[PDB]
Each structure stands twice: as C-alpha cells, then as structure tokens.
C-alpha cells in the first residue's frame, strides 16, 4: 500500500522523528484524500502491522480520538504542538540533574540524549552508564552519541545492571507507552533495572511524551498483547518501582496518568 | 505610596532578619493584607502591569527568605484569583480592583476557619485506648488532639527537638489538658516505635509530590513507621503547599548558627571541627499515609490535582 | 609449574585440579614458603575464586620429617573432593518437583548433575536458562541438556525478569561462597537473585565443600579486583538465598561460617 511508502517516505526524510510522530502525520496527510472512520482504522491497521510498537498504535487511537473543515485545522495545530514535545520534556528535566552525580540510562533513546545534551548546555558535569542491550546494539550507539559530546560515557554489560546499581545516583529510561496505571513498555531489560533501584531505594526516573499514553492495564507480564512482544522486544514496569515522570504535559506522578486518560475516555 | 514601601521595607527586613509572625496562619494572613494594600494603593490600567508588580514583588520577598514557604504561596494564590477574574471578564479595565479585594477577603475568612476546619476531623481518625506520638510543635497538632481529647482518650508521646527543644511547651500544653503525655528525646524514635499504633505530626511546606519539609528529625520518624506499617498523618493547612519539587531547588534546607549543635565555649577544636546544623529535612512521598486538609483527608497521590487547582502553572517559576 | 593440562579430561573442575598439582608437587616446615610460592604461581592461569579457596584449604591443610600423614591426609581429601558432586545431586535432587520449572544463569556441572539425578528418577520438568552474553556458557548449557531429554529453552540476559514469575524454583552454582553466606557467581546472578527475591521465589545454591572462601565483602566494590577480572564476576548477599546444597548437607547461608571458624581458617 502506498500507506507503508508514504510511512516509510517520513522514517526515511527525517532520521530523529519518533514512529507515532510520523504514523499521526501520514494519517493526517491521507485524510486529505461516518465512513471516514472505519477508512481511518483500517489506516491505523497496516500501519501498526508494519511497524509492532506500542507508540504507533497510541498515536493512532489518540489521533481517531481528535477525529471524534475543522479536523484539518486540529491536526496541524496538534502535530505542531507535539513537535516540541521533546524541548518541553528536555527544559523540565535536566534540573533534576545535580553536579557530581552517575546516570545509568537504558538502549538508545533520542528523548534522552536530547534531555543530556540540554542539561550539557547549563555547564553541568556528570557520569553516565548505558546498558548494551544484547537484543540489538543500540546501547553502544548510545554511547558513542553520548561521548560525542564531550562526557565520559562507559558501556556497561546487560548482566551487570545489578553490579553497578550501587555506583548509581539516579537513572533515567525512556518508554514505548505509558500503560493507564502508571507503568511503563520498554525494553525487555528495564523490569529487572528497576526492581534493583527499588531494592537500593534509586531514583528511577522515566521520560516519555504525552502521545505514548496508552489504554492499556497489563497485570503481569503475560497480559501484555504479543504483538507489541514480537524473545520478546519489550516488558511492563509496574507504577511501584517508578519515582516521577517527565512528559510534555509537565512532571507528573504514576498516578496522575489515569487521570488525565480518564478525562479523555480514551 | 511612600508609606506603602516602607511598610513593604519593614516586612522584607524582619522576614530577612528574623521572620515576621511566630505562627504560619499570621504570617499568611499578614502576607496576603500586604499584597491586598499593594493591590489597593497603587496605580494600574491593564492587569498585565498589576500581574507583574505582584510577581516582582513576590520574588523580592522569596529573595528576602527563600526557606519560608507560606508567602511564595499566597503570591501565587492572589496571582490566579487575578488571572481567574480576568477570564471571567474578558471570557474590565475599569471595575475590575473591587471584585480582587472582595474576593481576597473570601480568602482571608477562610483562612482563619482553617483551624476549625482541621480540628473537626479529630473524631474521624483517634479511636480509645490509642498511642499516638508527635515531635516538635504545631499549632493545628495541638488543637487536632486536645479536641478529641474531652469525649475520647488515648496516650501521647512527643519528642523533643535536638537543636531547638520545641516540644517541651507541646507537651506541657497538652499535659494542662489532662491527656496522659509523655515527654522523650529524638533518639528513642525507633527505641519506642513498636508499641505505637499510629504517629500526627505537622510540617512547614508540602511539596508538589506530596512530600513534605518539616523540622529537622521527622524523616527518620517517617521511616520508622513505614518499617513498622504505622500510618503517619499530617495536618497542614492548604496554605502550606507549594507547587515545588523536592529536587529542582538549592538552599532546601535553612542552616542556623552552629552554637546551637556546638557552643562556642568549648575551646580551640572549634577551629578544626566543622558543624552543621539543618533546620528542615525532606521526607519523600511513600512514608505518607493521609493528608488532614480544610477539605477532609486526602491520599499523598492526590496532590497534584490541588495543584493544579489552586496555583496556575506559568505562575510557579513566579 | 607444568602447562594448564591435568585438566586434560574436561569434567574435573579448576579446583580440584589445582589441588592435585599441589599434592603432587608435595611429594618432591620450610614446605610453607615453596608451597605458597606454588599457589600463587598457580593463580595467574586461573582469576577464579575456586582456585584459591582450594589453595588456602591445603594450605590451613599441610597446618617436616613426618610427611607419611600428611601425604595419607592428601590423597583422602581429594577422595572425598572428587566424590563431592555425586553426594551434592543425591542430597539435591529431591527439592525438583514434577512439572516444576527451572531457572539457571550459566553452565555448570553441580546443575547438571543434578538435573541428571533427578530426570534419572522419572521426574518430568522445564529448564530455562540465561545465554551467559559474557561467555556463551548457556548455550553449551542448554546443549548438554536437550540431550537428557528435558525440554530447555534459551532466553536473553536482560530477559531474566520477564520469565521470573513463570519460574517455580532458582537453582544456580556458586563459583565461591563468602563467610557471611553469599556466594560470588557470574556477573548475572545477583539481578536475577534480586528478581527473584521481590516474588517470594526459592532461590537454592549448589556448591562444593572447596570453595569456601574466607571473605567478607561488604558491597559490589568489596570484592577482590583480582576475581572480577567488563568484571566477570560478582557478589550475591545471603539474605536473598534460601539453602545451600553442598556435600556436607543441605544448611542455610549462616552456616558456612560456622564451619569456617571451626576450621580457624
């Protein structure tokens, strides 16, 4: 389908651009071409196929959700909004940032290299622990952006989370969607990084946007869907063992996420 | 007004030199009678000039003493009564003071009803043949137990402070009642803290993530009760929240001479030895178990939606 | 002394070859010197903890003319150190339940061994094991045991949380085992102890009599730098084991330091 060229037209045109980010502009550059609804669902079904990600699917429920003359005008003022989505999230977290202090950071995230390269900025000096992520070295590709910068990066081992957890002021992940309890989807090691900053009472921070909010309330780790799974790619944190959160909409608490779902009913 | 700014001159020196009022309520109360005369002699067309006068006027005064959190909030709260009667009127240059006045006298009445308002929750909460224990001294903790104690009774035990010994006249105040009190140090918290069945104590702020910055010495005792799992309960007043994180902010603690840890008659190890002496303390949100509020209890999980209500958000960077 | 080759035959253990070489090379006071020479030439083959544990265990050991005993002494330790394992499984093996499932980090021949036993007894279980990303031990791991007919399955290092609550029992070799009654294992075993820990999981340990180390370490730093060498290694409080399967019994982990102070060692 030429859904998948034109989705794949935006990965490609910009290299930083997040997967709900460009899923919601090609929905909204297609709906430039009641029935609308199921042609917009069906949109957001081979989207979500191609790419298995819980952003994706988010980013099309919240963009039927707007869809529910005036829808163009909406969109275009949303998209513009959310595009400064990371500077909002970057200017209100890289405070919580103190001289002297070790990060440990998850896989590779653009949402947090944005955060440190702002916090960079404000003559502040820190050390930083990225975890390689076996399933795909993409850890190690943070690093080296990471020291690219100018700031003394060390690539830890994917066994040693648990070893280095003590040498560790605070750690900040990044998070595929933000599940209506307050947990997060990330990646297939963080469940087990957070229960160790639990258990050494580390503040576990956690970064994500507001379009990653997703209708969702897994139990355990089974109840997640197996299609965002699929050696699974991703796992669900519980709200008990995360600290704050940092989003766009401003430093919000595990709880005030339901919330804000319930005042927009999905 | 020249009057007006040596009043204003004469509230920053004695916040800057020695604190105003002894009390929070005063203080409050004379904080938003200052901003209400500003509000009245001065001279203003749009509410944009009126705004940022009271901003500028506020971040002096939070200049002035950074640790006392009770004017910053009254700032802010007269700051959204302004926004909110603007959008009620443009969603107006010319009748728009009188209404700001009356409504600040709502806020000034209420204010003062805050401690009746909290001492009516006595019964909800203090059951028969209970031990609950305090430290420091707080006026709302006074009046929350001494007005259950006539119809019920129960055993209190209140630790004094380390560096400022405040809770002595707590004690002697509740013992005039006939309570049954007991007075102790802050070293025999957890010694005591196993046959203790529940712990009401009050603060100087609450912060926006539902911790709290009391005295020195109440995040051991939070600590103690969260491995005990004995519910701990703050009254404060809603005067006393701020929309501020724990971190994101230096100076969070006040540091007061070191002659009361050390004094200064001791000799010449004065010189080598290095003494500190923090006034405050941060207690985090998870060692919370209710907030006693003007409006009823409250969860430490549902702060933010006070927040939000009471402040604006472009207004906590003030 | 001689190249790394008494290890020849692959079953036998680091330990237990180094032992041999050291009784052998006794039969070539002022024995001390030359012998403590030995194991420290002996150690810069091996940065293993199992090494050295067997080392300071012959050396409180030999504690010169009467060397008739001491050569008797020698030859029924190590005896009773190469009986060790199949004692361990037999006193192991009756903690696996039918239809149970396992969780191992990385290949060792105690777990093995034991599995063994307890397959050998008509016992019906799945095994999932850790690919052990420093070293790819838990892919021989799960070879060696697809053999035995058991239904193993390979899973990533990271996701040793995901697979935690589907797990009955934790069942790990120690490399190590601290007097307080930790163990210094794999880098991958304290996150998964911890894990392990926060849902109420058995968390069981098998070990050797030889590798008890006379050593306190006090956190993740505390540990010799020597073992650790990206570290190898790393240290697991006692608090977060449950029992230790070893030749002497089965004791829980503040019993090891019993019987290190009624060694004097």
Request: proline share 4%; aromatic share 8%; charged share 25%.
């Amino acid at each position: 389908k030429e859904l998948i060229e034109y989705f794949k037209s935006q990965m490609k045109e910009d290299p930083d651009m997040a997967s709900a980010v460009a899923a919601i502009r090609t929905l909204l550059e297609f709906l430039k071409r009641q029935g609308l609804r199921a042609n917009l669902t069906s949109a957001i079904e081979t989207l979500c196929g191609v790419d298995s990600s819980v952003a994706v699917s988010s980013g099309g429920e919240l963009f039927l959700r707007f869809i529910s003359k005036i829808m163009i005008e909406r969109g275009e003022l949303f998209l513009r909004r959310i595009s400064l989505s990371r500077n909002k999230i970057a200017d209100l977290c890289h405070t919580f940032i103190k001289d002297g202090a070790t990060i440990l950071t998850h896989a590779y995230s653009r949402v947090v290299l944005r955060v440190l390269e702002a916090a960079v900025a404000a003559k502040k000096r820190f050390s930083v622990y990225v975890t390689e992520s076996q399933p795909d070295l993409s850890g190690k590709k943070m690093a080296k952006a990471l020291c690219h910068l100018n700031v003394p990066v060390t690539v830890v081992l994917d066994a040693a989370v648990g070893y280095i957890m003590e040498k560790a002021d605070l750690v900040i992940v990044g998070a595929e969607g933000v599940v209506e309890n307050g947990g997060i989807i990330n990646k297939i090691g963080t469940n087990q990084m957070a229960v160790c900053a639990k258990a050494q009472n580390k503040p576990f921070y956690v970064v994500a946007e507001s379009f990653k909010f997703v209708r969702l309330f897994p139990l355990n780790q089974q109840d997640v869907p197996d299609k965002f799974k699929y050696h699974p790619w991703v796992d669900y944190t519980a709200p008990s063992l995360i600290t704050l959160l940092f989003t766009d909409l401003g430093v919000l608490t595990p709880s005030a996420v339901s919330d804000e779902l319930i005042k927009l009913y999905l | 007004g020249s009057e007006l700014s040596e009043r204003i001159e004469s509230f920053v020196e004695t916040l800057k030199r020695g604190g105003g009022p002894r009390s929070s309520e005063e203080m409050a109360r004379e904080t938003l009678g200052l901003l209400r005369q500003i509000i009245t002699d001065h001279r203003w067309s749009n509410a944009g000039e009126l705004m940022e006068l009271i901003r500028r006027e506020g971040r002096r005064m939070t200049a002035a003493q950074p640790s006392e959190t009770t004017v910053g909030n009254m700032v802010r709260r007269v700051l959204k009564i302004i926004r909110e009667e603007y959008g009620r009127l443009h969603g107006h240059y010319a009748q728009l003071q009188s209404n700001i006045i009356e409504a600040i006298n709502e806020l000034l009445v209420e204010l003062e009803g805050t401690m009746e308002n909290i001492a009516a929750q006595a019964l909800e909460h203090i059951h028969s043949n209970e031990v609950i224990m305090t430290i420091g001294f707080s006026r709302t903790v006074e009046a929350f137990l001494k007005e259950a104690a006539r119809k019920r009774k129960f055993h209190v035990i209140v630790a004094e402070c380390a560096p400022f010994c405040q809770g002595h006249e707590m004690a002697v105040n509740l013992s005039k009642a006939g309570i049954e009190t007991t007075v102790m140090t802050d070293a025999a918290i957890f010694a005591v803290m196993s046959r203790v069945n529940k712990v009401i104590i009050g603060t100087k702020t609450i912060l926006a993530n539902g911790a709290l910055r009391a005295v020195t010495g109440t995040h051991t005792l939070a600590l103690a009760a969260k491995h005990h799992s004995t519910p701990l309960i703050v009254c404060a007043p809603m005067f006393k929240l701020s929309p501020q994180f724990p971190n994101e902010e230096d100076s969070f603690h006040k540091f007061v001479a070191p002659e009361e840890v050390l004094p200064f008659t001791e000799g010449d190890i004065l010189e080598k030895v290095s003494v500190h002496c923090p006034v405050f303390d941060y207690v985090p949100p998870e060692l919370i178990t209710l907030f006693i509020s003007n409006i009823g209890g409250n969860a430490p999980s549902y702060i933010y939606r006070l927040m939000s209500e009471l402040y604006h958000p472009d207004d906590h960077v003030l």
